[PDB]
Amino acid sequence: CSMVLDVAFVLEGSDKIGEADFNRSKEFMEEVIQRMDVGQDSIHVTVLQYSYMVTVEYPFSEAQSKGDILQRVREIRYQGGNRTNTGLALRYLSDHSFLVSQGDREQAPALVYMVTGNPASDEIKRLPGDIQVVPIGVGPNANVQELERIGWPNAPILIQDFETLPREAPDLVLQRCSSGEGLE
Ligand code: NA
């Protein structure tokens, strides 16, 4: 995927996920970033982790080089929170992450890949249309119809388990990046 695009990665880091599965989420994300054409004139990346609260791990406003991003990703510490506040994570995206004051490019399309394995603890609201969300529902505990509503027009990418996530999902994520649409 090589284009002008602002991409957000949102990882659930709750106790229900656990440290091992969160590390698998991280490794999935690292692999995607490696395959993407990340640079100042191309793809820009922001990274968020959420559970009880939301942490901006890497804002758009910081240096948009692959090396700097990937190293910050390695430095991300699993929070292990007692909630899955997906609605709050979405609010961060619309009301913080994709603002020009936080490094967002006004003329670039906005795309979010959100990795979750549990139903939302909180109230969810569909984002403004300009922020495209591709939910990645991992494991048997994902609330699929909830993700379908968050995702529209994007179908959720459903992954059987966190072990499969780093192996299977990057290909699908990059296909969606380049084409602008999911498969079949
Ligand atoms: Na944008």
Side-chain angles (χ1 to χ4, degrees):
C1 189
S2 189
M3 62 179 295
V4 176
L5 216 200
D6 294 333
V7 178
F9 296 97
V10 179
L11 264 42
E12 191 194 339
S14 68
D15 187 59
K16 282 181 181 173
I17 302 291
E19 193 163 41
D21 285 355
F22 179 77
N23 284 340
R24 291 173 176 107
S25 296
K26 267 180 60 165
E27 292 160 7
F28 149 78
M29 181 174 65
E30 281 168 36
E31 181 55 24
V32 174
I33 292 161
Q34 288 272 218
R35 286 150 174 247
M36 280 178 169
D37 188 31
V38 179
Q40 204 63 243
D41 298 351
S42 50
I43 295 170
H44 287 197
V45 178
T46 190
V47 178
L48 294 78
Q49 188 194 171
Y50 82 98
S51 52
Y52 175 81
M53 65 177 287
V54 180
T55 303
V56 176
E57 303 286 0
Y58 205 91
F60 282 128
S61 57
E62 283 185 27
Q64 289 301 318
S65 73
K66 200 180 284 190
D68 282 13
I69 295 159
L70 286 170
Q71 189 45 38
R72 190 86 66 175
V73 168
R74 291 185 195 97
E75 289 161 1
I76 295 172
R77 293 178 181 175
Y78 165 73
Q79 53 194 225
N82 65 334
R83 298 284 181 270
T84 302
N85 289 332
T86 310
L88 181 67
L90 293 168
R91 188 157 66 90
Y92 266 72
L93 299 163
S94 62
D95 299 13
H96 184 81
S97 301
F98 291 98
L99 300 185
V100 176
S101 62
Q102 301 297 325
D104 170 75
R105 292 172 296 183
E106 204 73 291
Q107 288 295 324
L111 223 197
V112 182
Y113 295 100
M114 188 174 68
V115 183
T116 182
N118 298 286
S121 303
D122 60 350
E123 185 181 65
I124 54 146
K125 293 179 173 183
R126 194 180 77 90
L127 296 182
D130 73 300
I131 305 166
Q132 287 290 297
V133 183
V134 180
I136 303 162
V138 188
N141 301 323
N143 184 343
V144 178
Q145 19 294 323
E146 187 172 68
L147 295 175
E148 287 177 317
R149 291 177 171 277
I150 297 161
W152 194 93
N154 311 293
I157 297 169
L158 301 185
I159 305 293
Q160 61 173 334
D161 51 50
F162 283 93
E163 167 72 21
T164 312
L165 177 69
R167 295 190 286 103
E168 189 200 322
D171 279 353
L172 301 173
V173 165
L174 278 132
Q175 193 286 319
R176 172 61 180 78
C177 186
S178 58
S179 82
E181 289 172 61
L183 288 172
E184 58 93 42

mmCIF file of all heavy atoms in Angstrom, residues 5-6 60 98 104-111 130, ligand 1:
data_model
loop_
_atom_site.group_PDB
_atom_site.id
_atom_site.type_symbol
_atom_site.label_atom_id
_atom_site.label_comp_id
_atom_site.label_asym_id
_atom_site.label_seq_id
_atom_site.Cartn_x
_atom_site.Cartn_y
_atom_site.Cartn_z
ATOM 1 N N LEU A 5 -2.404 8.731 2.916
ATOM 2 C CA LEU A 5 -3.382 8.097 3.798
ATOM 3 C C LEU A 5 -2.970 8.279 5.253
ATOM 4 O O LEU A 5 -1.806 8.082 5.606
ATOM 5 C CB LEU A 5 -3.452 6.593 3.495
ATOM 6 C CG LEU A 5 -4.743 5.760 3.555
ATOM 7 C CD1 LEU A 5 -4.370 4.296 3.693
ATOM 8 C CD2 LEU A 5 -5.698 6.149 4.661
ATOM 9 N N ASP A 6 -3.926 8.652 6.099
ATOM 10 C CA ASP A 6 -3.694 8.680 7.542
ATOM 11 C C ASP A 6 -4.316 7.428 8.162
ATOM 12 O O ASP A 6 -5.541 7.283 8.187
ATOM 13 C CB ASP A 6 -4.283 9.947 8.172
ATOM 14 C CG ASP A 6 -3.582 11.226 7.718
ATOM 15 O OD1 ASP A 6 -2.387 11.185 7.346
ATOM 16 O OD2 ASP A 6 -4.237 12.287 7.750
ATOM 17 N N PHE A 60 -0.032 11.379 15.189
ATOM 18 C CA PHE A 60 0.310 11.785 13.820
ATOM 19 C C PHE A 60 1.367 12.890 13.792
ATOM 20 O O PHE A 60 2.150 12.985 12.844
ATOM 21 C CB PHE A 60 -0.927 12.289 13.069
ATOM 22 C CG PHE A 60 -1.835 11.200 12.570
ATOM 23 C CD1 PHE A 60 -3.193 11.234 12.863
ATOM 24 C CD2 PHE A 60 -1.341 10.154 11.794
ATOM 25 C CE1 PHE A 60 -4.050 10.237 12.396
ATOM 26 C CE2 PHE A 60 -2.187 9.150 11.330
ATOM 27 C CZ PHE A 60 -3.544 9.194 11.630
ATOM 28 N N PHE A 98 -7.739 12.462 14.591
ATOM 29 C CA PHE A 98 -7.861 12.965 13.225
ATOM 30 C C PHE A 98 -8.160 14.463 13.156
ATOM 31 O O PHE A 98 -8.909 14.923 12.292
ATOM 32 C CB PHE A 98 -8.883 12.141 12.436
ATOM 33 C CG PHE A 98 -8.423 10.739 12.140
ATOM 34 C CD1 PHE A 98 -8.832 9.675 12.938
ATOM 35 C CD2 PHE A 98 -7.565 10.486 11.073
ATOM 36 C CE1 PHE A 98 -8.402 8.376 12.674
ATOM 37 C CE2 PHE A 98 -7.126 9.190 10.801
ATOM 38 C CZ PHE A 98 -7.547 8.133 11.604
ATOM 39 N N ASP A 104 -3.043 15.484 11.739
ATOM 40 C CA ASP A 104 -3.877 14.984 10.645
ATOM 41 C C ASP A 104 -3.768 15.869 9.401
ATOM 42 O O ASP A 104 -3.766 17.099 9.503
ATOM 43 C CB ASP A 104 -5.334 14.890 11.114
ATOM 44 C CG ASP A 104 -6.309 14.611 9.986
ATOM 45 O OD1 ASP A 104 -6.367 13.457 9.516
ATOM 46 O OD2 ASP A 104 -7.024 15.547 9.566
ATOM 47 N N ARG A 105 -3.662 15.230 8.236
ATOM 48 C CA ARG A 105 -3.670 15.929 6.951
ATOM 49 C C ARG A 105 -5.098 16.028 6.427
ATOM 50 O O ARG A 105 -5.757 15.010 6.199
ATOM 51 C CB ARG A 105 -2.786 15.212 5.929
ATOM 52 C CG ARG A 105 -1.295 15.267 6.232
ATOM 53 C CD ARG A 105 -0.510 14.363 5.295
ATOM 54 N NE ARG A 105 -0.866 12.954 5.466
ATOM 55 C CZ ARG A 105 -0.288 11.943 4.822
ATOM 56 N NH1 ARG A 105 0.688 12.168 3.950
ATOM 57 N NH2 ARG A 105 -0.689 10.700 5.054
ATOM 58 N N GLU A 106 -5.561 17.260 6.224
ATOM 59 C CA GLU A 106 -6.962 17.527 5.895
ATOM 60 C C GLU A 106 -7.430 16.915 4.569
ATOM 61 O O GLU A 106 -8.591 16.526 4.438
ATOM 62 C CB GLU A 106 -7.241 19.036 5.921
ATOM 63 C CG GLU A 106 -8.707 19.415 6.167
ATOM 64 C CD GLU A 106 -9.155 19.198 7.610
ATOM 65 O OE1 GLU A 106 -9.258 18.029 8.046
ATOM 66 O OE2 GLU A 106 -9.418 20.202 8.308
ATOM 67 N N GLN A 107 -6.523 16.815 3.602
ATOM 68 C CA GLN A 107 -6.868 16.301 2.273
ATOM 69 C C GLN A 107 -6.694 14.785 2.127
ATOM 70 O O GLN A 107 -7.099 14.202 1.116
ATOM 71 C CB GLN A 107 -6.082 17.045 1.186
ATOM 72 C CG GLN A 107 -6.555 18.482 0.944
ATOM 73 C CD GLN A 107 -7.971 18.561 0.385
ATOM 74 O OE1 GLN A 107 -8.390 17.720 -0.415
ATOM 75 N NE2 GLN A 107 -8.712 19.583 0.803
ATOM 76 N N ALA A 108 -6.096 14.156 3.136
ATOM 77 C CA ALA A 108 -5.878 12.711 3.132
ATOM 78 C C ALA A 108 -7.106 11.954 3.642
ATOM 79 O O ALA A 108 -7.766 12.411 4.577
ATOM 80 C CB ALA A 108 -4.657 12.359 3.975
ATOM 81 N N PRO A 109 -7.418 10.797 3.029
ATOM 82 C CA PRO A 109 -8.451 9.919 3.582
ATOM 83 C C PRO A 109 -8.005 9.321 4.918
ATOM 84 O O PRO A 109 -6.803 9.178 5.161
ATOM 85 C CB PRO A 109 -8.589 8.822 2.521
ATOM 86 C CG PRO A 109 -7.298 8.834 1.779
ATOM 87 C CD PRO A 109 -6.843 10.258 1.783
ATOM 88 N N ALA A 110 -8.972 8.992 5.772
ATOM 89 C CA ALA A 110 -8.697 8.458 7.107
ATOM 90 C C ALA A 110 -9.140 7.000 7.214
ATOM 91 O O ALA A 110 -10.263 6.661 6.840
ATOM 92 C CB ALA A 110 -9.404 9.298 8.154
ATOM 93 N N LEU A 111 -8.262 6.147 7.738
ATOM 94 C CA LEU A 111 -8.555 4.717 7.853
ATOM 95 C C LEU A 111 -8.128 4.189 9.219
ATOM 96 O O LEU A 111 -7.035 4.499 9.693
ATOM 97 C CB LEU A 111 -7.819 3.938 6.760
ATOM 98 C CG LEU A 111 -8.489 2.812 5.963
ATOM 99 C CD1 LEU A 111 -7.416 1.981 5.275
ATOM 100 C CD2 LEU A 111 -9.401 1.915 6.782
ATOM 101 N N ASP A 130 -16.289 10.262 7.331
ATOM 102 C CA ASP A 130 -14.922 10.496 6.840
ATOM 103 C C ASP A 130 -13.866 9.607 7.506
ATOM 104 O O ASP A 130 -12.788 9.387 6.951
ATOM 105 C CB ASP A 130 -14.536 11.978 6.973
ATOM 106 C CG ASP A 130 -14.274 12.395 8.415
ATOM 107 O OD1 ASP A 130 -15.193 12.276 9.255
ATOM 108 O OD2 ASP A 130 -13.147 12.856 8.704
HETATM 109 NA NA NA B 1 -7.181 12.496 7.319
#
